[PDB]
């Protein structure tokens, strides 16, 4: 609930480095589509992402 705005930055919890996502699209089923500012190798499909 309460999706972030487009261009807003998100933070991935528990990554090897600080992984900052940036919201690019609102995909449509409470999904945003983000671009990562670092590598996504080591990302799991349950990882909690907090909105800044």
């Amino acid at each position: 609930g309460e999706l972030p705005s487009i261009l807003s930055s998100l933070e991935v919890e528990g990554h090897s480095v600080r992984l900052v996502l940036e919201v690019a699209q609102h995909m449509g089923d409470n999904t945003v589509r983000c671009i990562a500012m670092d590598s996504t190798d080591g990302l799991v499909r349950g990882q909690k992402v907090v909105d800044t």
Binding site: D41, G42, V44
Partner: protein, 483 residues
């Protein structure tokens, strides 16, 4: 440990769709029940897109996929030296498992701004066309670019063979450990090349990471990164590494295959949009580290095969904008017998003159200047119109420097026997020797000059005023052929 399973949904076009594997990481090495490895590439909402490091024929729908728990890794360490591995670090030479080794990631971020330092110490290739004109420092990326059969590997091979000869005469703290990454080549020519490195003794320091033309395209895509992780072991522990990715032209074609089979939209020459980042991610890992990171270094020699001298191709210009220098090997000079067929007008070394032999730095300055005029004169005196008898002087002088930079294959020269031979030809001592005799004539120069001149020049690193007084004397006393 609890084993996480996953069924294969559908396999084919080199990629399996895998149901399950809910906690798999992006980029994780997965293992199929046929033994074949795979990389978890696309984590989707309902499946995992796995690229298969090998033949997709052994995978069926309903096969079990196990996760290994870690991102794609290869074994790195001193137990890899001497060994011929495939694109995943598994040995194919039949000499048992890699003992004395430790697994590390193949996809590592290259060191940043604050982790590098300037490239200062030279790396000698043993090729006097290279080591005098296009000098290569430790931590540099030097593109060997040319057409088909222009001596691209010959330059990479003599660099590796020369590092064995230099490693016997130096302390352990400055010893270059080579890696040859063979991508998309014939398993025949890798077997000729392992024999060549074995009978020379160069395989004591060389790793051979081979992904041949019969291997799967994700294995050819990965072997530059598998080879670079093996050579980053020496970069990170304070030692020095050389790497040759022979045909990065063939890595990108293997990567273009994976992109078009993943139904990704193609760009210039049907290449993916991230085919720049393919080689950019790889060649930035060849760095010269700072003193706080150890001072280690990795020198890359990417090889790119052009088509008809077209250096303005897509992958060719991608790597020219990645690498520091460029060794352009020409096909017209190659069929005229000039081998190594260096395009002196185009071959450059960005870092270059800051990291060459100070003897060669003060000899080959007037070598690349006089070869510039010989290129300038014989671009305008093609017609045989008229002669100034000074332009015909530099036509006869530039023809002597060209034969002076010819070199045979699998016989690298030390840098002290190189800079004396360029001193012998630029200082007029090889005047009036016929241009069909200078191959024999500086074989006479290097053999008849006292060996102490090469030892004084090797240790001082520079032609001292006491030495060029003595070296001019010892070149006066030389039985040149024909007189």
């Amino acid at each position: 440990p609890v084993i996480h399973l996953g069924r294969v949904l559908s396999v084919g076009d080199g990629i399996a769709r895998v149901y399950g594997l809910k906690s798999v990481q992006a980029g994780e090495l997965v293992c199929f029940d046929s033994g074949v490895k795979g990389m978890a590439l696309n984590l989707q909402a309902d499946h995992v897109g796995v690229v298969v490091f090998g033949n997709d024929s052994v995978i069926h729908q309903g096969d079990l996929v196990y996760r290994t728990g870690q991102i794609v890794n290869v074994p790195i360490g001193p137990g890899t030296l001497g060994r011929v591995t495939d694109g995943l670090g598994q040995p194919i030479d039949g000499k048992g498992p890699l003992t004395n080794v430790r697994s590390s990631l193949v996809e590592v971020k290259a060191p940043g701004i604050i982790a590098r330092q300037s490239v200062r110490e030279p790396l000698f290739t043993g090729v006097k066309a290279v080591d005098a004109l296009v000098p290569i420092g430790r931590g540099q990326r030097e593109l060997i670019i040319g057409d088909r059969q222009t001596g691209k590997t010959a330059v990479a091979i003599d660099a590796i063979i020369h590092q064995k000869n230099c490693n016997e005469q130096v302390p352990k703290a400055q010893r270059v450990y080579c890696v040859y990454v063979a991508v998309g080549q014939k398993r025949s020519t890798v077997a000729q090349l392992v024999k060549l490195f074995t009978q020379t003794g160069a395989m004591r320091y060389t790793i051979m990471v081979s992904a041949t033309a019969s291997d799967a395209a994700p294995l050819q895509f990965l072997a530059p990164y598998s080879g670079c992780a093996m050579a980053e072991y020496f970069r990170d522990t304070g030692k020095h590494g050389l790497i040759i990715y022979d045909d990065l032209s063939k890595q990108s074609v293997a990567y273009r295959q994976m992109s078009l089979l993943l139904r990704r939209p193609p760009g210039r020459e049907a290449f993916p949009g991230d085919v720049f980042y393919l080689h950019s991610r790889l060649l930035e890992r060849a760095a010269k580290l700072s003193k706080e990171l150890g001072g280690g270094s990795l020198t890359a020699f990417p090889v790119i095969e052009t088509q008809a001298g077209d250096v303005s191709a897509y992958i060719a210009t991608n790597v020219i904008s990645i690498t520091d220098g460029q060794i352009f090997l020409e096909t017209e000079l190659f069929y005229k017998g000039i081998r190594p067929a260096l395009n002196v007008g185009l071959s450059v070394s960005r870092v270059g003159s800051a990291a060459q032999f100070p003897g060669m730095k003060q000899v080959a300055g007037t070598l690349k200047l006089e070869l510039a005029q010989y290129r300038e004169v014989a671009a305008f005196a093609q017609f045989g119109s008229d002669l100034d008898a000074a332009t015909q002087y530099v036509l006869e002088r530039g023809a002597r420097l060209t034969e002076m930079l010819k070199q045979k294959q699998f016989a690298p020269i030390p840098i002290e026997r190189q800079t004396v031979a360029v001193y012998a030809a630029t200082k007029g001592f090889l005047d009036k020797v016929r241009v069909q005799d200078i191959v024999a004539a500086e074989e006479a120069v290097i053999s008849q000059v006292n060996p102490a001149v090469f030892k004084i020049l090797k240790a001082n690193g520079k032609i001292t005023p006491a030495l060029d007084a003595h070296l001019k004397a010892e070149l006066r006393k030389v039985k040149l052929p024909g007189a």
